[model samples]
Target: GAPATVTEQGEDITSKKDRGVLKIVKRVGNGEETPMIGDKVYVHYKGKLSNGKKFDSSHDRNEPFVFSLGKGQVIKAWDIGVATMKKGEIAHLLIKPEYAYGSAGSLPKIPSNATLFFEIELLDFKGE
Candidate 1:
């Protein structure tokens, strides 16, 4: 089956503010309560190449991945995308090579200069 498409504001989940790298699929909590810089975030996500080949998933492991906002703890797209998410929000990001692993890629599963797609669910988090 094809992956689900995210729609927001009566349009596809593409944000002009983030240069089309980020998209919000669903808003489950207060947007005003979205994460701030350095706040910790716990989430589950599935990552795939543009061809739809899955590369990784926290859902498969049945555990959430944790990282801090604006701390260089993960990929650039994640840092920017997740910050815009409220608790319990589900989003999808179309991350270009510049915002992803870049030309070098992550090796093994991800190839060089690949455009990655991700479906992310924000389970919960602490701090402002």
Candidate 2:
């Protein structure tokens, strides 16, 4: 597949781009519900650095990672970026250092104060 492009929507991508956060890749299945604060979401994601060095991937494990929203159980960017998505949506997230691992990154793979990129797919979820 080709890379997803960010556009000047004056609201969607434009506003988020200014915040240095999310970029929508593909939006699918409008009928699916968007996740709320306490929802338990299951997703497949690939984490990488800006230089395109891959750090981690749930797809490799053939399992979807599960987490509850707004619970600080995951990265700040995941909480923020995933909340805007519906089921079956795929998004490319550009997360700044503060929203990622911050000053002290997860060692052996992620470096300190690094900006992260993620291609995320919302597969399924359970509502609270």
Write candidate 2's Cα lDDT for 76-128 as tens digits: 88888888777888887776677789799987788898777788888888888
Model 1 per-residue lDDT tens digits across residues 1-128: 22334322312323445444746465465556888888889999888986787578997798889998889989888887887788878776777777888889988888898877788888887884
Residue pairs with colliding backbones in model 2 are none
- Give TM-scores for every candidate, taking all chains together and pairing residue i with residue i: 0.80, 0.81
Candidate 2 local distance difference test against the native: 0.74
Top candidate by TM-score: 2
Please give me the total number of clashing residue pairs in predicted model 2.
0
Instruction: Give lDDT for model 1.
Output: 0.74
Look at candidate 1 and give me any clashing residue pairs. Answer: none
